């Protein structure tokens, strides 16, 4: 049995994870009490992946909840699926980080992380075989960027042979939501790059465009954006829970997707997304999904993959399909658009197919891609970063908590080198 630990840090991770447990609870037929009210039996064979069992045929999710303010947590408890979480796994404090990475990593979060790890060490030992960890957080704030990367270093040292799969919201290019995004993200990227195996880069600006152009939602709230991310989180681990023709897992996706140990930042996606009124006008076929998967405008990364080259991509399908229709179509993409694919990887596409689709769709698809267009995200932050650091714009709130100017230069060099390591593979000579 393969099992996963979920960790929800901050206001962005918890508001996502709550929908993740609101989505997963639907595929497995669990109601908000923790009781099973399903129809099929495949909903129970591998329930041990995300959930643990209880006395009266009740199922408690193996989730961990972390923040530095109680507001995020009381929303979960006072909500649709609040009761299922183990109340001893709501870990929190007071006096939030203040969008200061220094406060989440060194000063305040350090006084709370020991309680967090004890909950981790309990859940992990209750598992038969641990596969990996699942973190949902945000870059741009203090808690998710500081308290998250603090846990990552600790879990990695304790569990170095397991996968650390990290879902992360990156800062947008046009409009910020904090002033100190580039300081906090650069310091977080310095830690993720060294202490993860696969991290999925999500951007809120792209999710607005997806809701705008495809779903035709002109008043999209955060409950809808997270309703997109939660899908991708489900598609990745589908083949650990349901049966299929050609199986896959987190370690198999990593091996194919990650050629070098540092280039593990991905641009996710999900199909088939459509308007509620334009669903009875398209045929749901595998080639309809591939056209939607490799579309520049269905990526949640806010980077144009047509400004680079795909190093290796993946495609996790779900439903009754024909493997000729799947492999023939992934081939047509590589041969047609040969310039957006690396020359020294003859087949840049891994595949996976599951026989159990989502609750109300004949079939679904999930897309994971590693491209050199992520260059634009780390390059953009560095220009913001150095312009602020060249004059020490907001630095005196970070040094005041026990940081030096040296630690900023390290995060800049490592980020800038990664920018070149991706750019080393954009030229064809």
């Amino acid at each position: 049995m393969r099992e996963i630990v979920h960790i929800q840090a901050g206001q962005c991770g918890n508001q996502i994870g709550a929908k993740f447990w609101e989505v997963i609870s639907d595929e497995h037929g669990i109601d908000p009490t923790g009781s099973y009210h399903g129809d099929s039996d495949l909903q129970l064979e591998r329930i041990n992946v995300y959930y643990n069992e209880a006395t009266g045929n009740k199922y408690v999710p193996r989730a961990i909840l972390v923040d530095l303010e109680p507001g995020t947590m009381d929303s979960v408890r006072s909500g649709p699926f609040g009761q299922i979480f183990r109340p001893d796994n709501f870990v929190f404090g007071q006096s939030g980080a203040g969008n200061n990475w220094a406060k989440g990593h060194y000063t305040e979060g350090a006084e709370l992380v020991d309680s967090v790890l004890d909950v981790v060490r309990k859940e992990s030992e209750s598992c038969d075989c641990l596969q990996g960890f699942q973190l949902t957080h945000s870059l741009g704030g203090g808690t998710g960027s500081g308290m998250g990367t603090l846990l990552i270093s600790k879990i990695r040292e304790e569990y170095p042979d397991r996968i650390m799969n990290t879902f992360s919201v990156m800062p947008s290019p046009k409009v910020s939501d904090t002033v100190v995004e580039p300081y906090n993200a650069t310091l977080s990227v310095h830690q993720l790059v060294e202490n993860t195996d696969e991290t999925y880069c999500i951007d809120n600006e792209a999710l607005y465009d997806i809701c705008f152009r495809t779903l035709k939602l002109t008043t999209p709230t955060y409950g809808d954006l997270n309703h997109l991310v939660s899908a991708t989180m489900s598609g990745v681990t589908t083949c650990l829970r349901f049966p299929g023709q050609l199986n896959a897992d987190l370690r198999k996706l990593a091996v194919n997707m990650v050629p070098f140990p540092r280039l593990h930042f991905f641009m996710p996606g999900f199909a088939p997304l459509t308007s509620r009124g334009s669903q009875q006008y398209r045929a749901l076929t595998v080639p309809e999904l591939t056209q939607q998967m490799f579309d520049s405008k269905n990526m949640m990364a806010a980077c144009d993959p047509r400004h680079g080259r795909y190093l290796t991509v993946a495609a996790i399908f779900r439903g009754r399909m024909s493997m000729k229709e799947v492999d023939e179509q992934m081939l047509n993409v590589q041969n047609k658009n040969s310039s957006y694919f690396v020359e020294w990887i003859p087949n840049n596409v891994k595949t996976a197919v599951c026989d159990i689709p989502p609750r109300g769709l004949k079939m679904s698809a999930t897309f994971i891609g590693n491209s050199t267009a992520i260059q634009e995200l780390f390059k953009r932050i560095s220009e913001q970063f150095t312009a602020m650091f060249r004059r020490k714009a907001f630095l005196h709130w970070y040094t005041g908590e026990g940081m030096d100017e040296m630690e900023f230069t390290e995060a800049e060099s490592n980020m800038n080198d990664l920018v070149s390591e991706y750019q080393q593979y954009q030229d064809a000579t």
Partner: protein
């Protein structure tokens, strides 16, 4: 849980405080007698939010506030008004003499004999908390109390409590309108002292609001019972994320980080866009864009300082009510597209956003209308250096002849303290200039 102490000093503080707790009681369902009949009708809930109101077992809800004047008149309105049964009777009216609009009186002579009580009741209030987030000092430049007593107090709290946010909400002196001859001195004196202890001082001038109420609310002859209701709303938006639910919550240490680049330029402004009458509540949509653009209008600032003569460093936008995030992102981009709004080269992000789901409430008898969404802006601009210069020139004109000085020496001040405080404001005038110089290589 999250708990803040509101302090109001002097007359400009109290008459604002009376408007605030008028509002805090309505949003939470509290009557003036401290009771909450809804909770016994409900059987649950913490709507008696322990940020601003402590609760006893008898059902009475007691506010976390201390305010003091050094004259007994204005508090005595409260000890005999409609809110007497709400407050703790420990309100400081040890004000047998006033500060006579003298710093030297609120900092020394009658600056003491009253402070040991003030620190004790605060320490009692803090000992009732499961965690503090900071202070909220409401005062006014120009007086002796709001200038002197505010400084002595801010000094002591920086020793006993230390690293706790201290947010000031002060009445900045206006360029033309003024109710005193010796305002320039008192402002430069406490500004010198409060600079090294405060973290973010939110400025407001009474001259801008007179025009806001004129043009927007269509009040042709307002008084301080109107100016102080708007100021009550600016504070509610700042402190809303500690009481009610929301999507993007904002704690008090987040203003300290995003709006204060360097430790000496922590003088931001404020405003409130959808300030409209009941009649003009019709005829308008009041979307996120129309409200957000108004906050950048130079005519709707609550401080008389044209931002077009300077550059923006940081801006925190706090939304309330039925607001969707995409509407904010689309709007903030529209502002960065407009060329009359120049940001410093070293701050390409510039904007912070905060969103809440509890709309504003309407104080009955008021001039503001009921709306579904409301916005509060907080900005740090280089234009305010012009206002510091006006005060320094007024200072120099009437200090070159040593006018009104013998009233300050008569209380214990030295002739040299004026210089020591004029030099620190001449260094501040440069730091605002050094920041605004675009970089080169």
């Amino acid at each position: 849980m999250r708990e803040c102490i509101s302090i109001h000093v002097g007359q400009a503080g109290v008459q604002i405080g009376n408007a605030c707790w008028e509002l805090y009681c309505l949003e939470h369902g509290i009557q003036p007698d401290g009771q909450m009949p809804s909770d016994k009708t409900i059987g649950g809930g913490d709507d008696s939010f322990n940020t601003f109101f402590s609760e006893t077992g008898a059902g009475k809800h007691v506010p976390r506030a201390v305010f003091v004047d050094l004259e007994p008149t204005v508090i005595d309105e409260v000890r005999t008004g409609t809110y007497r049964q709400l407050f703790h009777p420990e309100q400081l009216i040890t004000g047998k003499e006033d500060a006579a609009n003298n710093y030297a009186r609120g900092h020394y002579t009658i600056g003491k004999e009253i402070i040991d009580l003030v620190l004790d009741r605060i320490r009692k209030l803090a000992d009732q908390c499961t965690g503090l987030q900071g202070f909220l000092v409401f005062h006014s430049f120009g007086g002796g109390t709001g200038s002197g007593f505010t400084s002595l107090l801010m000094e002591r709290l920086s020793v006993d409590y230390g690293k706790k946010s201290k947010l000031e909400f002060s009445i900045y002196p206006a360029p033309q309108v003024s109710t005193a001859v010796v305002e320039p001195y008192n402002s430069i004196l406490t500004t010198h002292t409060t600079l090294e202890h405060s973290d973010c001082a939110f400025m407001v001038d009474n001259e801008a609001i007179y025009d806001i109420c004129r043009r927007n609310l269509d009040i042709e002859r307002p008084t301080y019972t109107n100016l102080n209701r708007l100021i009550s709303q600016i504070v509610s938006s700042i402190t809303a994320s500690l009481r009610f639910d929301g999507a993007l919550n904002v704690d008090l240490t987040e203003f300290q980080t995003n709006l204060v680049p360097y430790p000496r330029i922590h003088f931001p402004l404020a405003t409130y866009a959808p300030v409209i009458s009941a009649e003009k509540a019709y005829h308008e949509q009041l979307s996120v864009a129309e409200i957000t653009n108004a906050c950048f209008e130079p005519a709707n600032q609550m401080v008389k300082c044209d931002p077009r003569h300077g550059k923006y460093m940081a801006c925190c936008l706090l939304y309330r009510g039925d607001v969707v995030p995409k509407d904010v992102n689309a709007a903030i981009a529209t502002i960065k597209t407009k060329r009359s709004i120049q940001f410093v080269d070293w701050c390409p992000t510039g904007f912070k956003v905060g969103i809440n789901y509890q709309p504003p409430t309407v104080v009955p008898g008021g001039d503001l209308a009921k709306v579904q969404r409301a916005v509060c802006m907080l900005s740090n601009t280089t234009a305010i250096a012009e206002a510091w210069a006006r005060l320094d020139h007024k200072f120099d004109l009437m200090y070159a002849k040593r006018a009104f000085v013998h009233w300050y020496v008569g209380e214990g001040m030295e002739e040299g303290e004026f210089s020591e405080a004029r030099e620190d404001m001449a260094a501040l005038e440069k730091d605002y200039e050094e920041v605004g110089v675009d970089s080169v290589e």
